[PDB]
């Protein structure tokens, strides 16, 4: 499935950038998984937040390798919604042994055990929202909300305004993609976009009961999306 490989969610990323111009693009040459997410989140907004104050060189260190660190910074200065997809299997102990069959899967295609899952972090309402269309394929949704909670403390004193922490919010309330069917990365893209559209609204109420009218709508979601990331320049940063 074309939204299934990290490129095309980068692509995706842009697009909400050029659409809403006011989402950081997703750095995919820093893989993310269960390992080393949280340390992340933390490195890109207290980067954020020294731009805030105009300290640029922590910026200049945590620049992506095809960005220039000061269209970096301009991003960083304007983004209030900072998407983070993690990638995890559930085979792989060890971030070596994720990060090789991370890049087999892109580079081969073969989707196996693999899945994407998506934290929305928004600094214009102070809230860390997780998604998952499966619920609960990483870990147990309360495992999950108590690592994003205490990443929660940490983001309110990273980012004051005072050092109050985030609210944490479980966007997937239930479950929506059925068994059989290798759909994440796309439904992660359209839980995004219902997100800049109105950060208030429940997923429960988007996305119907019967199964071919659900699969109708992300098969919709995913042309139509397709056909606006068609006509681009490959993998570059959008401006401001």
């Not at 295609?109 to 609960?136: A, K, M, P, Q």
């Not at 109708?216 to 995913?222: K, M, P």
Request: aromatic share 10%; glycine share 4%.
């Amino acid at each position: 499935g074309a939204l299934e490989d990290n490129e095309h969610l980068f692509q995706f990323s842009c697009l909400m950038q050029n659409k809403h111009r006011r989402v950081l693009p997703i750095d995919i040459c820093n893989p993310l998984t269960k390992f080393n997410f949280l340390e992340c989140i933390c490195n890109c907004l207290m980067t954020k937040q020294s731009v805030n104050v105009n300290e640029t060189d922590m910026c200049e260190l945590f620049c992506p390798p095809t960005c220039t660190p000061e269209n970096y910074r301009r991003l960083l200065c304007t983004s209030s919604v900072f998407p983070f997809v993690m990638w995890h299997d559930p085979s792989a102990d060890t971030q070596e042994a994720m990060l090789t069959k991370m890049d087999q899967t892109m580079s081969s295609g073969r989707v196996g055990n693999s899945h994407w899952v998506l934290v929305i972090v928004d600094i214009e309402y102070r809230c860390v929202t997780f998604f998952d269309s499966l619920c609960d394929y990483v870990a147990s949704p309360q495992q999950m909300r108590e690592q994003l909670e205490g990443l929660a403390v940490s983001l309110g004193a990273i980012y004051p305004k005072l050092l109050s922490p985030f609210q944490v919010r479980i966007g997937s309330t239930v479950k929506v993609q059925s068994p059989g069917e290798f759909t994440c990365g796309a439904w992660c893209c359209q839980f995004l976009a219902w997100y800049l559209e109105n950060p208030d609204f429940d997923l429960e109420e988007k996305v119907p009961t019967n199964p071919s009218e659900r699969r109708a709508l992300l098969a919709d979601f995913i042309s139509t999306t397709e056909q606006a990331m068609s006509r681009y320049s490959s993998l570059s940063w959008p401006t401001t």
